[PDB]
Swiss-Prot record:
UniProt family annotation: Belongs to the glutathionylspermidine synthase preATP-grasp family.
Function of the molecule: May be a ligase forming an amide bond. Shows ATPase activity. Despite its similarity to the C-terminal synthetase domain of Gss, is not a glutathionylspermidine (Gsp) synthetase. Cannot synthesize Gsp, glutathione (GSH), or GSH intermediates, from GSH and spermidine, cysteine and glutamate, gamma-glutamylcysteine and spermidine, and gamma-glutamylcysteine and glycine. Does not bind to Gsp.
Protein name, as recorded: Putative acid--amine ligase YjfC
Keyword Membrane listed: no
Residues engaged in binding ATP: 103-105, 267, 304, 311, 339, 374-376
Site feature Transition state stabilizer, where: 103
Keyword Magnesium: yes
SUPFAM superfamilies: Glutathione synthetase ATP-binding domain-like, PreATP-grasp domain
Highest classification ranks of the organism: Bacteria, Pseudomonadati, Pseudomonadota, Gammaproteobacteria, Enterobacterales
Gene: yjfC
Knockout-associated phenotype: Deletion of this gene does not affect the ability to synthesize glutathionylspermidine. There is no visible differences between wild-type and mutant strain growth in LB media.
Signal peptide boundaries: none
Single Gene Ontology MF annotation: ligase activity
């Protein structure tokens, strides 16, 4: 009973639905992004046994990596974390600064275990699509009969987000920030803000570019109010490269995601998982650039940056060391890791990637991306899925 994809009719009023629900990036410069012309059908057993339980287990494995890495300067060095920040990252972990969310990327292997490619443990997007828009799609699809009436979906993300913001409630305003000139980032953060407000959390939005510093480096908003806690859709590694990075050592602001997530939002995680859990069914052999390769001669392999996103500067090599595929990106100068190669599955002419969501520590949903090559990148489309049987 294999997982499959099938065509489905696009809703005749899709553009109106997107507009009415704040989905202002379902089309991106006149290219389809949200793609409901097809859908993936999983069984409940595939969800529970191959996606949900392994995601939860992998997150526990990642927390063990954090606990070991904060104690080991050689590991922190391999992770390319600047030594200025080792103490504050270690303290962030020791205080167990609260986490909100993270998203793993998986290569689907049919009846075999999924393979973990990376852990977007800091600033994952495709959240609005995964938590909200595809659930509305499911409700419409069940009633129009294009999928079974009793179809489900692997998706409790919104409920877990709201409940997590409830656990983190403070009388102090919770700031939300992202950079300018990206509707996707703004709407991802707006969605999180909406979830926080549904839990009773007073929330304020400010652009990263509008953040100010008062005397002595106190973080302030545009009205010179002191910012005590903020969610930032902005990479931890960029915060630590910023000229104002050293201010993080004072721990005067609460950040979500917290500083200890810098160990996980880091492709150096993949060699560390392979080191500490060799042979785990969901892991691929992986090593830092310069270490002895952990594949045999002839096998294909992947090189990718430690810090990157959206497929930037991924190279797939064959076992004669020729380039199989390569993606442009702004990360050409970052240090690199290697990983054994597991091609994404191909459906029609698209290559399919599973993003599996964690909220705090709970596996609670998934969203699918399709793209035209083996390397998921900036042209990828989001595709709904459902559960049947
Ligand atoms: N070990 C691998 N085997 C096969 N494909 C890979 C591997 N690692 C990455 N890829 C491809 O490259 C894409 C991007 O890699 P990923 O680790 O998700 O980094 P990011 O999305 O942060 O650039 C993946 O979605 C997949 O298409
Ligand atoms: Mg990815
Ligand atoms: Mg990524």
């Amino acid at each position: 009973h294999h997982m499959l994809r099938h065509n489905v009719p696009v809703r005749r009023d899709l553009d109106q639905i997107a507009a009415d629900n704040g989905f202002d990036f379902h089309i991106i410069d006149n290219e389809i992004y949200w793609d409901e012309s097809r859908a993936y059908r999983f069984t409940l057993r595939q969800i529970e046994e191959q996606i949900e339980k392994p995601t939860a287990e992998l997150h526990q494995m990642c927390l063990e990596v954090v606990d070991r890495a904060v104690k080991d300067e050689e590991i922190l060095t391999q992770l390319a974390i600047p030594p200025l920040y080792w103490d504050v990252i270690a303290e962030s972990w020791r205080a167990r600064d609260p986490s909100l969310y993270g998203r793993m990327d998986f290569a689907w292997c049919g009846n075999a275990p999924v393979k973990l490619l990376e852990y977007n443990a800091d600033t994952p997007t495709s959240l609005y699509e995964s938590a909200y828009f595809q659930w509305l799609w499911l409700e419409d699809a069940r009633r129009s009969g294009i999928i079974p009436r009793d179809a489900d979906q692997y998706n409790a993300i919104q409920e877990r987000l709201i409940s997590r913001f409830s656990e983190l409630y403070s009388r102090e305003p919770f700031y939300f920030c992202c950079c300018q000139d990206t509707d996707e980032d703004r709407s991802t953060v707006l969605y999180l803000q909406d979830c926080a407000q549904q839990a009773g959390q007073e929330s304020r939005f400010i652009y990263i570019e509008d953040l100010g510093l008062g005397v002595g480096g106190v973080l302030t908003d545009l009205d010179d109010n002191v910012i005590q806690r903020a969610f930032k859709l902005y990479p931890l590694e960029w915060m630590m490269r910023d000229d104002n990075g050293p201010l993080l050592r004072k721990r005067r602001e609460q950040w979500v995601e917290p500083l200890w997530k810098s160990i996980l939002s880091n492709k150096g995680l993949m060699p560390l998982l392979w080191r500490f859990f060799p042979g785990h069914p969901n892991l691929l052999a992986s090593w830092f650039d310069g270490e002895k390769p952990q594949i045999a001669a002839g096998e294909s392999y992947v090189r990718k940056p430690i810090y990157s996103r959206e497929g930037g500067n991924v190279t797939i090599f064959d076992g004669k060391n020729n380039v199989v595929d390569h993606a442009d990106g702004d990360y050409a100068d970052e240090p690199m890791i290697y990983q054994a190669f597991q091609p994404l599955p191909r459906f029609g002419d698209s290559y399919t990637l599973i993003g599996s969501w964690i909220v705090d520590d709970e596996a609670c949903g998934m969203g699918i991306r399709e793209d035209n090559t083996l390397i998921t990148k900036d042209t990828s489309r989001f595709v709904p899925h459902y559960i049947a049987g």
